[PDB]
């Protein structure tokens, strides 16, 4: 999989999602070659890149123009993007213009999490999966609550990752901020 | 991916490796359909199962007969194993009888880690990858050291995973023991 | 400090709080010899024992009779308890019958967290401290929210602890479930 | 206890040790008012400050002059230091010039960990305690090994701490790098 260091970064754009998290998102999503996926809040394009090479169509959404731009660049550098529809603008509006989906990954909730999830529920193909990426303590709670209130069986996994950094004196373990994945049953 | 609960367990056999770890091993291994892989210390068969459905040939090794047996069962229950060669007996001896490999995953080091790694280095095809699973503090150190002394560029990632358990009162987070992955460059 | 293994346990009573957590609670509480403290949901008595030997008076509350019982026992085995008032029954009622407090530690929220916190706010002596122990994801959120809505400056710290277990083959790290401490400014 | 933010920091000097770690070091050390303690690799002075206000004498050692300097400053700002002997220079040499000790905390091993521990073993008063702070993977291993080879019963505890950071959108959990504490029996 593409490591964090091989991504094009931008100051106003957060990400990429740590590779270890992207790895788990892919496993929970269970991407099929005929699946249609949406990535709400694509940021640097980490999740978009991985999905792109595994499903039929990927719709990448973000309010931040810089994010659409960075995702666009990372897509090209790795020769993907032919099956990716980039969409700038407000998440709720953009989601209304999209076909039904098999996989929905919601990163930057952008405050409108509850609305985004309701909309996503109305477009979810049977057997579809929703995966919410949470950095804020409130998102972990809000996501769990919404998904349960929309009738899904909800689960949550928190990851704490430490990678070794080679120093002269030795290998020191460097932490990544904890990331929680709230996901609905398959 | 196959979740931990859908595996056939045995008392004298450890595992399965937590799904989140198996997920990362697969990502680091970058399994190609024409790759030959070896799984030293296959245990319950977690890694063997995942590799089986993605590479050309998998050689699963373990000293413990119960492990070969459990791996065998889990393979059957999921309709895999046609491309898996099970091998009971001492790791170093078994490795000498195997073709050259593209991917090597070393779980249960079984004390002979240093020797196993040397042997694996002599059979690694160019561009091959080695991934060592460490539970013991000594294995983390020893693996790092050996691989470096064998001339590889070594990395290490520690994972701390917590999964939510639905209780009546609410969702409590339950921890998994930390697991470290020591891996060589691609 | 008293280690987890030197506590008398009971089936229906959770605890003791991991020593590493009890250690941080004591540090955040800043127990003075003339302070009056309340321990809501005392469980096995871990926090009660530590406070007992450092403040003037400790009021230990729990609905579960077994818990009051276990706390009672652990208090005796360590020769403390002269300055501890045990109180069985519903937390909100019991809190109404107690003097004003300098330190309040709330363990087993027992569903009535919001009410317990309001009450505790009305009895808090100036410069007092509140520390909420959270195991459930909802308690972390609810505590943060209540305390903020009651006008306190709120903080949160999550601890993930692993202790080494000496095995014949080596030292394996064993995890404790994550525990969060939500506390108000001093 | 003194929070991380109330310390004077310096570029070339690492620390302060996270408060949650300092809290546990104090608990493992069990500082008595008549104890003599040594802090090898005092850095910003975190451990030195805490020990200062609890034992009879504290000998703070560090090769880095800037560290001695920073510790000196933090001591003053909190009105401590009357019972602290600062010592610049190479750890092994400095330790030879100190009285026997009750408590020894070794932070910045500075490569000479093995020698430092040997020396410390020869000056440890009966019932004395040694606590080694490890950031590097190699130190965790080396400390465990040395202390065992010097005849102590060794233990290890790894802490992963996350603190909440109030943002407008909510409270995001921010991680601290993992820290291991290797300590000998009391």
From Swiss-Prot, chains A, B, C, D:
Binding site for S-adenosyl-L-methionine: 17, 41-45, 62, 91
UniProt enzyme class: transferase
EC number in record: 2.1.1.196
Keyword Transferase: yes
Pathways per UniProt: Cofactor biosynthesis; adenosylcobalamin biosynthesis; cob(II)yrinate a,c-diamide from sirohydrochlorin (anaerobic route): step 8/10
Keywords for this protein: Cobalamin biosynthesis, Methyltransferase, S-adenosyl-L-methionine, Transferase
GO molecular function: cobalt-precorrin-6B C5-methyltransferase activity; protein methyltransferase activity
Keyword DNA-binding: no
Record's catalysed reaction(s): Co-precorrin-6B + S-adenosyl-L-methionine = Co-precorrin-7 + S-adenosyl-L-homocysteine + CO2
SUPFAM superfamilies documented for this protein: S-adenosyl-L-methionine-dependent methyltransferases
Matching Pfam families: Methyltransf_31 (PF13847)
Any one GO BP annotation for this protein: anaerobic cobalamin biosynthetic process
Quaternary structure (record): Homotetramer.
The family this protein is said to belong to: Belongs to the methyltransferase superfamily. Archaeal-type CbiT family.
The name this protein goes by in its record: Probable cobalt-precorrin-6B C(15)-methyltransferase (decarboxylating)
UniProt organism field: Methanothermobacter thermautotrophicus (strain ATCC 29096 / DSM 1053 / JCM 10044 / NBRC 100330 / Delta H)
Source species taxonomy: Archaea, Methanobacteriati, Methanobacteriota, Methanomada group, Methanobacteria
């Amino acid at each position: 999989m593409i490591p964090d260091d091989e991504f094009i970064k931008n100051p106003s754009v957060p990400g990429p999602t740590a590779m270890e998290v992207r790895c788990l998102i892919m496993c929970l999503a269970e991407p099929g070659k005929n699946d249609v996926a949406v990535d709400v809040g694509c940021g640097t394009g980490g999740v978009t890149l991985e999905l792109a090479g595994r499903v039929r169509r990927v719709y990448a959404i973000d309010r931040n123009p810089e994010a659409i731009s960075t995702t666009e660049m990372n897509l090209q550098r790795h020769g993907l993007g032919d099956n990716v529809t980039l969409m700038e603008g407000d998440a709720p509006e953009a989601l209304c213009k999209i076909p039904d989906i098999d996989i929905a990954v919601v990163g930057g909730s952008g405050g409108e999490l509850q609305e985004i999830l309701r909309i996503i529920k109305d477009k979810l193909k049977p057997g579809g999966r929703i995966i919410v990426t949470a950095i804020l303590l409130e998102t972990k709670f809000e996501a769990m609550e919404c998904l349960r209130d929309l009738g899904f069986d909800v689960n949550i996994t928190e990851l704490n990752i430490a990678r070794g950094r080679a120093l002269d004196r030795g290998t020191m373990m460097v932490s990544r901020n904890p990331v929680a994945l709230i996901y609905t049953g398959v």
